[PDB]
Amino acid sequence: ADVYFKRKSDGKLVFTAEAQTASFSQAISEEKLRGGIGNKPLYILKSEKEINLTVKNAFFDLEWLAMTEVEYRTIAYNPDTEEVYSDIYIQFPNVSPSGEFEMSLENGNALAPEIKFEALADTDTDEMAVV
Amino acid sequence: ADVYFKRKSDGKLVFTAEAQTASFSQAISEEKLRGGIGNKPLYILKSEKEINLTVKNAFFDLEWLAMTEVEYRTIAYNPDTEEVYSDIYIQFPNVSPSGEFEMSLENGNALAPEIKFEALADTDTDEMAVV
Amino acid sequence: DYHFEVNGTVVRHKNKGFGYMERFFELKESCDERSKLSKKQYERFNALFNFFEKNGVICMAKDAGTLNTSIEINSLAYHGKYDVMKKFIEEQSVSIEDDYKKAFFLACLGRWEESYDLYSNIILNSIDESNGCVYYLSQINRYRIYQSITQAVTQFNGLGLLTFGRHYKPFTDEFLARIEREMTNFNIDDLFNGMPFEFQKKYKILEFLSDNQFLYDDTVKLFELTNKVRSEMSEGSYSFGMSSDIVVLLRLYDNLRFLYENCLWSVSFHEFHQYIRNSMSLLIEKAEYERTRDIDELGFSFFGKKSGFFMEYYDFVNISRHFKIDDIKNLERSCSIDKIRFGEQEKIEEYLVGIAEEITKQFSANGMNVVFYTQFISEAKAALYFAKYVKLSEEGLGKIVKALLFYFPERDLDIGKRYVWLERLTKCNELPKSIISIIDDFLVLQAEKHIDQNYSEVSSNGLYSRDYGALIKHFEKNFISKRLSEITLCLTQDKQKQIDFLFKLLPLLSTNAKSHLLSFKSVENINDLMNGIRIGLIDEFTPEHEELIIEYLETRKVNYIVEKEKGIQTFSSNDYMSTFGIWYFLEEINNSKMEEFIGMDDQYDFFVDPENFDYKKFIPSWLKNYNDKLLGKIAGNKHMKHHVIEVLKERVKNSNDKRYLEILMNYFI
Amino acid sequence: NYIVEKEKGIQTFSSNDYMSTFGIWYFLEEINNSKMEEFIGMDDQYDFFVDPENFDYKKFIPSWLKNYNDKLLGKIAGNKHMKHHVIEVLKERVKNSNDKRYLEILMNYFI
Amino acid sequence: EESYDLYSNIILNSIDESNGCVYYLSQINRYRIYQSITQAVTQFNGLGLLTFGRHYKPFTDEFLARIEREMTNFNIDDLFNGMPFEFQKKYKILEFLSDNQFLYDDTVKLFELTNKVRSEMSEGSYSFGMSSDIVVLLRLYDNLRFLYENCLWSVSFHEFHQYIRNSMSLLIEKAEYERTRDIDELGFSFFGKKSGFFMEYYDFVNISRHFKIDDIKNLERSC
C-alpha cells in the first residue's frame, strides 16, 4: 500500500505515504429536494458519490520543496498473491488537498499526520478509475 | 428512590439505600424446548422474565449486624406531582443478593459499593408485585 | 529518539544524530558485519537479538513485509493452572526471582496472607545484588496485596454476611493490624523517585507503574482508538494498511503479557478487568460488523480476507476471566459470537474441564478458600457461560455438566440459573445418554434434601425442576427415572413438598409410580393445571378444571375493588390471567364468566376482546413471549392484524432488536 | 474500450454514472431500442435492468436501492421475477445492516 | 508572536506580589502557545503548500530562532516541582496542570462512564436518582468552565476536542435512545419528562466548536 501524489498537468511528485482510511460513502435519497418530483419527467438523478481517503506518513519531494489540479495513484497486489495480473491503479485525477490542523502536542511530532483528502469532479464524472 | 432491604423471617430491615439501576430484561431465547412441543395440546405462555435492582449507598443497620431468603420494600415520590402521581411501592417478595467482589482499588477508594441483588420466584410468580 | 510501534516496526522520532537503531537493524541481515565487531561486542549483539526477538521487536519499518504475529503467554498463572501453583509453592527457595513467582502464584491462588509474608521477606533480602527491580515490583505488589486484603475483610464485614449466609474471617484481626502498620504513611506515587537513583536512570521504563493510576495511558489510547474504530464502523470506511482494530488487539496482548509476566498482582484488578473488557468487546463488535458488512464496489479487495478475525484460545481465557455474566449478555445481544470461527477449540476444552476439577475439589472436599472463591467464581462462571460457543467432547462435557449441577453453591447459581446454562451446553451438541445420567442424579439429590421438610425450590428466572424434565423429554421422548420411581411407595401423604415435587416430575416416573400418585393425589388448585400441560398430563379443559380458573379469577376482583378506593393498584406479575386469555383467544375455553372480567390486566384484556381492547396500553415486549403458529396464520385476516401493525412498523426503526425484526419478516407479509 | 481493455489483460469497472441511468431508462421504457441490449459487462447495474431475467444476482449490491427513489423501487416492486430476488437479498441485509434506509425500503413494499 | 511576547511580560512582571498562580498559569500557557507555534511553523514551512498554495510566513526566522533559544530542553512535567515549595502546598489544586497528559483522568472517567452508559442502555436499565448520563454532562461543564476560565490556551488543542467530542456525542446518543425506548410494565414514565435532555445554548457551542464534519456526519446517520 503506497500513494503517489502528483501535480496534474505538471507531473511533479508531491509526497509518498501509505493510505490507512478509505471511505466510499454512498449517495442518500432522503433530502427530498432533488426536484422534478410531482411531474417526474425522467429519472436522471444518479448517485452523488462521496469518497474520503487519508495517508499515514507523507514524505514530501525535496525538489518540490525548492519552489515554495493534482493527481494520485496507488498500488495493491496483496489479495491472493496476484501480482502479475489483477492490477488495480486507483485513479482519482482531481483529488482535493484537504486536512485540519489538529494541535494535539501531547505525543510530539509523528512525521507527517493523517492528511485528509477527497476526489473532486469535473464536467464529466471521473471520480474514480481502476486503470 | 430510597430502598429498604427487609428480612423475610422477621421484617427488620437488613439495610437501606437508594436505587441505582432497575433493569427489566426484555429478551426471550427462542429454542423450541419449553412447553409441550412433543405433542402441543394447549398453550402455556410462561416465558421467563428477569428483574434486577442495584443500589449505591447502603446503611447496614447495627441491630442486624449484631448477630455476626430476604426481601426489600421501597417508595418512589417526586415533588413535581404535575398531572400524574402515585404511591408506587415496587417490591419483590423474594430477592437474593448477587454482589461480586468488585475490587477496583486503583483510585484507592470504594466507599459504599454497588450492591446488586437478583429477585427470585417460589411457587407462583409472585415477584414484581407493586401492591 | 525512536518510536517503537506496537506492530513491531520502529521509526525515527527525535534521533537527530546517527541512526544507531537503524544501524543495529542494518547489521541484522548482514552476517559479516556482525563478525567485524569485537568478541564481547559480538556477544552483546547476540544477547540483544535474543531480547528483541523475545519481546516481539521486528526489523525496520521500511522492510515491513508480513506483520501479522500471534503473541504467547508463558506464565502459568494466566492459564489458571491452579494445580501447578500448589506444588510450586512447596518447592523451597532457589532464588529471589523464583520466590517472586511463588508470591504471585500465592496471591492468585488466594493465600494472600502467605503471599504478603512472602513479599515482606523479599524486600529484606533484596539489599544487595543490585536487583532493585524485583524489590521495586514486590513493593508495589505488596501494596496491591495489602489493598486487596483490606477490601476482602471489608466485603466480609459488609455485604458478606448475607451472601455467604454467615460471616467469614479468613484473616486474623492481628494480621489486619500488622499489614496496616507496615503500610503507614506510605504514598506509592513517589516510590520511583523515593528509591535509589541508579534505578531511576536505568529502569526508566518502569516509572509508569509507580503511580496508582498507572492504567491510564493505555486506557486513554484504547478510548481514543475505540472512538477511531467506531467512527470507521459507522462511516463504513475501509482500513487500508495497518488497522486500529489490529492495533488495539496487539496493545492488550502486550499489556496482558507485560503484567502476567514479571508477576504483577494488578492483573486481578478491576480496572485491568475493565481495560480488557472494553478492549475485547470492541474487537467483537468490529468482528461482527466485518462479517455483516456491505460489499461495496470500491475497496472490496484489501488486506483483510473473509473472516479476518478468529477467536483463539487466548481470547477465550480473557473473555472467561475479565468479563461478568451480564456484560457477556450485552456482547451476545450486540454481536452473534456463534458466527465467528472459534480457533484452537481443542486447546480450550481442557481449560474448561481444568476449571471444572478445581471447582469440584473446592466444594466437595472439606471447605473452600473463600478469599480465593470470591476472586475465582467470576472467572469460573464466565468460562462455563461462554462454553456454548465451543464444541466439546463427551468426556469434556461430562465433567463440566457434573461440575455445573453438583458443585456450584446456590448463593451464586440458583436452581433456575443452572437450567439457563444447561440449555447452552445442550444446544451446542446433541444430548448423549451420559449427560442425562448426571442430570437424573441431580434431580433425585434435591428430593433427598427435603429432610428438614421446609426447603422450597426458589429460582431467580422462575424456572424450576419443571424445565429439567422438559429438556429431558424434548431430547429423550421416552425416559423413566427409576430412583424417583421407587421413592413413591415409601411416601404416603408424609412430605407434602416432596408430594408436590412429583407433579412436575411426572414424565420421568414409571407407570406404577404415576398410578400411585394420581390414585388420591392430583390437581386441586389452579397451579397444577399449567404444570400438567407442560408435563402433558392435562390436555383438555375438563368442566371441573374450568371452574378452578374462574374461581381464582373471582378472588382478584375482591382486592381490585378495595384497592381502587384507596388509590392502590396491585400488579403482581403472576401472568396467570394472560394464560387464561390466550387460551380464550383461540376459544379453547368457552366460559363466559371470565369474559366478564375486564380492566384487570392489560395483556389479559388483549386476548379476550381483541377488537375493542385499548391498544394504547399495549406493550410490545409481550410479543417476545408468543408462539409461532398463532402469529403466522393471523396474516391477511385483518380483523386484528392491522391494529398491531402500527406497533410492528414502529419497532423496526425505533428499536435495533433483531427479534422484533424477525417477527415482521417471517409473518405479516 | 471494453474489448481493448483485454489487450493489457486488466478489466475495467469505472465508477462513472453513465451506464447506470441507461438501464433505468430501459427499465422505465423511456428508450425502446434493441441495439443497446447487446451491451453486457460494462456495469453491473446496467446488466441488472437491461436484462434482469439473466442477470447474475450474485453481483447485486444492496446500496443500489438506496439510490433509487420510491417510484423506481415501486416500479421494480412486484415484477414476479425481481420480486422473488429483491425480497431474498433485502431479508438477508436488513439484519446484517442496521441502516435506517434499508428498513424504510422493506416497509414501503411487500405489505 | 505577540501572545508569546506578551506572555513573557506576564511572567517577567510577576516577580513581586507573590502571585504564584498567575505566574504559574502563564508559564504553562506560555508552553502551550509555544507548542501551538511549533506545529504552526511545521504546517507552513512543512506540508509544503497543500491546503493553501502560497507560503505564508507569519513568524520571522529570527523569531523562530529566539523562541527555541529559551524553550530548548524544557520539560513541563517538572514545572510544578520547579515551583516554590510554598506554592506547592498552597496551590496543590493545580498540580495536574503541569502534566502534559492532564487530559487523562477526565477522559478515563468519561471512558469508564461511556462503558457503563453503553452497558446500561443495552439492557434497558433505568438510572434511578443520580443518573449516570447526567454526571458526564456535569463533568464536562466543569472541565469546560475551568479550562475556559483562568484563560488557558489548552482549550484549543485537539486532545481537549476529543474529550468534548466523545463526551457530547454520547450525550446525544443517550438522549436519542431515552426518547426512542420501549415501554415496560414496570418501567413506566412515573415522573420522567420523556426525553428530558434539551439542547441548551452551552450545548450547541460545544458541538459547534469541537466537532468536525467527518465526526458529526456519523452522528447524524446514527441518531
Numbering used by the authors:
A (entry chain B), B (entry chain C): 9 to 76, 172 to 234
C (entry chain D): 337 to 1005
D (entry chain A): 895 to 1005
E (entry chain A): 449 to 671
Paper text:
Defense-associated sirtuin 2 (DSR2) systems are widely distributed across prokaryotic genomes, providing robust protection against phage infection. Each DSR2 protomer consists of a conserved N-terminal Sirtuin (SIR2) domain, a C-terminal domain (CTD) and a middle domain (MD).
To avoid the cytotoxicity of DSR2 NADase activation, we co-expressed a catalytic mutant DSR2H171A lacking NADase activity with Tube protein, and successfully purified the DSR2H171A-Tube complex. To gain a better understanding of how DSR2 recognizes the phage tail tube protein, we reconstituted the Tube-bound complex DSR2H171A-Tube and determined its cryo-EM structure at a resolution of 3.58 Å. When the hexameric Tube is superimposed on the structure of the DSR2-Tube complex, a clash between the Tube hexamer and DSR2 is observed, explaining why only the monomeric Tube protein and not the hexameric Tube is able to activate the NADase activity of DSR2. Each Tube protein binds to two DSR2 proteins on the same side (3152.65 Å2 for DSR2(a) and 886.14 Å2 for DSR2(b), respectively). Upon interaction with the Tube protein, the circular solenoid lid of the CTD in DSR2 undergoes a downward rotation of approximately 30°, firmly attaching to the Tube.
